[PDB]
Design a binder for this molecule. Sequence first.
Ligand SMILES: O=C(O)c1cccc(C(=O)c2ccccc2)c1
Lengths: 164, 164
Amino acid sequence: IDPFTMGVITSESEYVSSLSAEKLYRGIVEDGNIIYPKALPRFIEKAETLEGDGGPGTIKKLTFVGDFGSTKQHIDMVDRENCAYTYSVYEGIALSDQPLEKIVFEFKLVPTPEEGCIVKSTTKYYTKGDDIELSKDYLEAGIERFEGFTKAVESFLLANPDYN
Amino acid sequence: IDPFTMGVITSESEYVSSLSAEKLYRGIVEDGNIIYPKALPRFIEKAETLEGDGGPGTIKKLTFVGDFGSTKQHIDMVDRENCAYTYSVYEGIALSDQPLEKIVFEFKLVPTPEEGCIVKSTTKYYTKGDDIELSKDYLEAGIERFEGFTKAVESFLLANPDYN
Ligand SMILES: O=C(O)c1cccc(C(=O)c2ccccc2)c1
């Protein structure tokens, strides 16, 4: 009687990039503050880090083009060595007026013998126990926006190898 | 495009038992084939072991009173020293036409100084990524029925200490 309930919905998607794991990781994680407005110019107006040096515990902020507000990313795991990166979002337009406690975004790049890499995207949606009602359309739009974000940075680096 | 989606819904409940952890664990895990029909006589008609010796990997079969078929439990963890027990169910009246891949049941006893114990019940619902719509009524009935089963065995054991 009167139990504790919580749901975790996990979505996974992969694709094969020709870009090396190190270069893609570097563009997304280390140089994202510079890359994002140039790689996603119709979405990201500005990318900055509010607190921290980039390691676990860092808070970055993407401010959107026009009048769409902003989103704060809470960096959780950072692993340059294995091209693994993880962060959480607790509020924002990523949540899209659904009953969510948080969203975790996970990203892992695996080298391929051709010096490409496999891009592994994961989203985890955390829901309280009164309302476990998430649209199958909504769930896959989130992973699709996230993986598409990666593809846009991949597109940018492929076209601009020498962006300093 | 086309991601793999999967949800895990977890429900937890605790209550304090008057039986000692050793006696309750032995009655529930080790002696269930004898205890279950005597402790839930309007529900369990027969409890048997299909495969295994009782350790991890064992398949038990409960036959229910009346026209409710049976349920197969696949034992995962058995740990007498820490009074921990885990099994999975893949089909049967426990599932009751909900869109489910499996249910994992965890049973864990924590000794208390009053030489009773804390009874820790957990149900985990695994659902595919096409629907992800589970009734909170359904979920809390399941943990309530699961915790309630333990209580009934506790009453039976307290009432029949010398059941061998
Ligand atoms: O979920 C149920 O209602 C249910 C039905 C029939 C048997 C069991 C069971 O074997 C068990 C095992 C350990 C602890 C409590 C219960 C549970």
